[PDB]
Point group: C5
Chain length 311, copies 5
């Protein structure tokens, strides 16, 4: 088995696509193994750049192809380089930008924690085995972290494992296990834009909706409920036009649904308080009792949604 040591440098993680559950990573790959001794000009390391690599492969140089098994498409490889030492060592160094996919769950959207993952695996070998994985995310974004969309916690997690492919050759004593390198980078979204421009104003609109119980006429309470209903629709548009698309409801959308429910429940109470001929449009304490019971009932419902997400 040819031992291969790998170092991954991460320069930039960006472009998270929520519907496809993909993200872009730009960085370097440094693979190093040990072949047989060779003679190089000047008995010093020999450097072979981008298009000269292909001429060495045709002459019989063994350069294993390393594939990302989560990449969507083909990574946009930039500059490549080989460094053939006279004692046998070979260092392969490449620049990559690709779109990677992972199971990402945005159900706590403004406060979600993701885990960007890179999986590396030799494309056509089972007994060329990876030993060391060093991940150097040298971008110490701890400084000026508050201007970045994603905060990166911890350094990185590396893991060398053996993946078994049972859908393989009949003769598979050890001919169906492939070495795999997994890199995990934890991240936390930056909940400042979504906490000041989406959640705070939505709390004020819903809070102002309970003001409808302070008007002093049945006709006034009903008519201003439709303006409130139009305000929430105009707010669900401002939200859905900015927030990322998802196949489930986040915590912002569940507040909007509660906004529709609060206004609609107010309309039923306004109508019921007016047309029950036991309190009627005369002295009626159902409205006064509703000035207090509506904020409390909504606050309790806000707690049920706040424990559903955490659990």
């Amino acid at each position: 088995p040819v031992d291969v040591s790998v170092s991954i440098f991460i320069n930039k993680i960006y472009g998270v696509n929520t519907l496809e559950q993909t993200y872009k990573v730009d960085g370097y790959i440094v693979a190093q193994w040990t072949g047989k001794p060779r003679k190089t000009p000047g008995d010093k390391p020999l450097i072979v750049e981008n298009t000269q690599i292909e001429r060495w492969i045709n002459n019989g140089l063994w350069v294993p192809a390393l594939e990302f098994i989560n990449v969507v498409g083909s990574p946009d490889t930039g500059n490549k380089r080989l460094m053939l030492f006279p004692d046998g060592r070979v260092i392969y160094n490449a620049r990559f930008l690709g779109s990677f996919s992972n199971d990402m769950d945005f159900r706590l959207f403004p406060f979600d924690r993701q885990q960007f993952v890179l999986e590396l695996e030799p494309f056509s070998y089972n007994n060329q085995q990876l030993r060391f994985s060093d991940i150097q995310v040298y971008t110490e974004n701890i400084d000026n972290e508050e201007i970045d969309e994603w905060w990166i916690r911890g350094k990185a997690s590396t893991h060398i494992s053996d993946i078994r492919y049972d859908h393989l050759s009949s003769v598979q004593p050890n001919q169906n296990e492939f070495s795999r390198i997994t890199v995990r980078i934890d991240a936390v979204r930056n909940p400042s834009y979504y906490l000041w421009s989406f959640i705070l104003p939505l709390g004020l609109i819903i809070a102002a909706s309970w003001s409808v119980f302070w008007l002093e006429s049945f006709s006034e309470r009903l008519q201003t409920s439709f303006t409130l209903m139009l305000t929430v629709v105009a707010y669900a548009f401002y939200t859905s036009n900015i927030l990322p698309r998802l196949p489930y409801t986040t915590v912002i959308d569940q507040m909007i649904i509660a906004g529709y429910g609060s206004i609609f429940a107010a309309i039923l109470l306004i109508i019921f308080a007016h047309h029950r001929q036991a309190n009627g449009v005369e002295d009626d304490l159902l409205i006064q009792r509703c000035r207090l019971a509506f904020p409390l009932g909504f606050l309790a419902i806000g707690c049920v949604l706040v424990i559903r997400g955490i659990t």
Copy 2:
């Protein structure tokens, strides 16, 4: 006829485009046939990766080109690999990401069932025949299925058939039939975001529109009908800005049309109840009889649309 056995691995189905009726599939192709015996270094399997394949074809190696006849454009092939055994077997292994087209019908949009299809066919041979097709959708997304946009039901359907091209050579005793592999994957859309953020609030807006018959003045009933009309337009915008574009009306759009109709029919009844000098603005039971007849009439219409889609 050279027998070819094919295995397709499906990694990711995503990016459904409703107007073009296309979708993206990423996975592997494994073709295997049996040529003539050859001598390989060490009498062990020989591996030929990406750019070394072209050097073997120039020397006379027979590598048939397999084409997807539903792909839109050219698939973005990544890593390729040949494995030439000494006893004659040849295994071709490639990575593909392409955009595939199929007749997709979204007329039940939030509850539609699709059928993603891959069709494979040799590009230039009629007596190189495919025998086996194994489809391994190993992505057991049954776990964490609720965070995915599409739920995949069943395993997969494979079928090897013979397609006849009558627009072909004059001498076509058997020279116009091509083997074809068809793969079908059933799917069901995830109706949670569209059932809580589009259908439920739309039911509340239309339900609140019937509240206009509880106001106690002709001037009030007419003026609040225009606010309701503005609310539905503001809702048709919030819907059309998120839902996928289609050349027909889905079930959400047919509710919006009923929303316009309900408000417009209310305006005619409000005006007619006021200007018929047989009940007039005095004691008038046409409005009271309309507090009940409007929700029932709309509920019945909702059933007609609910049976049109199923049938």
Copy 3:
């Protein structure tokens, strides 16, 4: 002159871009001519696929380049293939996906008829002449036609003509005429989504705007006219956010302009009926006479626009 027979297969017409007046076509090209007799292995047809074609051209095989003179850019050619018969025949078979441009006129937008056009012409020869053109649009989309955006009427129109380039060599006895193949496919847009979700509700909003003449106060008529004006603006946004961009006004936009005009003309009549001290805010039959004259006047204007488009 080398006679060339051409067959075009059309698989998919989609992606109409209204501003650029381009559309995408995916299909096959089959060119067939007759060269000089050659000797092939086994005295049977010889097949030369994608990258092996270039090795035959370098050895002196004559493969004329056929260009689409309406394509915007360069078509994305997929698989290619040559079939060299021993008696001299050569069949060239390629897969193309390109963006094609034609003079498209959308002035009747929801009911417009287009004409998708493909123009083929040898890139560098004047006495290599095309004789036969067969267009096989085998996609019998007559079934499930109602789920497609474009309905295709008729089969196809083919035409072989000679284009003269006067901007050419001084010696042009016949050295400036190029054979050209023109393919025309008629189509009609699917006017169901645009007839139920854009035209019908717009007719209801404008019809409900004439209800402003049934209110019984000058203050009420004026104030509800501004809500109507806001409704039409909110509707012109919902329309312009979905309809394709164009450099002229379609029939939907001309109804919106009439919507603005009807409301604005109503405001002038409401104000004039109140401030003319010959009928004044007292008994005034100008408003009653306007309950009828407004729908009729608007209906007549709708006919003028309905004959302008047809003519």
Copy 4:
């Protein structure tokens, strides 16, 4: 110096991007010079198409590279062709589609005049000099001009000049001057969609805003001013969602700003006319004097903006 004669054919100008100040041009380049006499098969012109050109360059054929110095990126060259005559002439013919940049000024947006520019220059030669430039915009779009986004006035302007690069070799007696071909095509935007769907309705909304001075109550005048303020915001959204993005204000945006100013100035006058206890809510001719002074003052302001743009 090798004399080079150039002909540019323009097929399509489209895709104007206002923020980047770029546009797309599709057409042909025909370069012709005179080398040394050669012997061709049959003593007739020899044609060398796309990939065979590279084999002639390797054997020492001089084919200068012509670069567009305004192109953003690299043009998407399609088919190429050489025509080597036996008497020495060489004709180079290529198909290009590229994105070109020029200083474009949209400050009169709906009535702006642009000037699409192509600049051509040999990439690495100073004494290979261009003599003739013929620009053949054969697209006589005078017919069906009204369905096109851009109207093209005049034919074309050509100019062969010498550009001096002072940032060049120390020995630059004449080794720093490069021949340059400049092509200019005048154009005028099609002001029909923007004159009927954006300017006319905006004139009606602002005109209807002056109707607020005809209501007969302080409470009514103030409340309907906020509906008008909401209408203009709803209109600035419909405008900014369709008009191209720019780093300055066009003439449409300056009308919207005047719309905000007119409504806001109306609010101050309504409040001031009510709370000055010299005319008060009693008989007050400041409002009546404002029914006339507001349209005139706004008309005069419209003239100041109409002379600022022209000057």
Copy 5:
């Protein structure tokens, strides 16, 4: 060490993407070093263009690969050129268009200052050292500067430094330091569109919101507060649909939040002034005292945000 002198020409800086913190730069690279003397045809400079460069590298010409270490992906290189002098000098000249990333901070969005950065570094050498860097931004955009999105202040800053990579070979006496060229171009955004179409009208809407304290009824003050609340939501949509996406709040968004707060604080005061039975709906000077205290309190808050950004 081989001395390399570099000149960068900048043609166009555009396409700033605020979420990815990237921008596009188009220009030239001119590298010049001195190899060993060679014999050229005619004893004059020899020019080797695009595809002929690769044939010289295969024969042993040393052409170091220069990489941009901030580029996202791979730059779209256009025309290349070598100029081999007989005395040994070699000049490498290339055209590039790439997407570059830098730490960009938009927290003062309409008045932000950016710093576009290009970093150049040899890809595989440590003792090939860069000496001179000349940056020639010849685009004297001082003229017609007001039609450009970005104003460029100063000329350019160049810097040649040594970057140490400690993650490198065990034998690193000097084998881990790489020469680096850094180019910085200061810029200031053009605050005209965002100062007239976003900040001025937002100041008028908030100013008009304080007019609610001049109405003379509790019912009128409350109902027109909800129209104001709808206006601000309709304005936050018009803003968020045009302004660039960011992960923090700019100065425009902080005014919108103050707009929500001002209206919501007004609602509490309106309700409190009506339901405190010490001033009540009778003669109440809390509203009059609020006609003045609201503009002043908001003006002071506007100063706190105006000093937070500067500090």
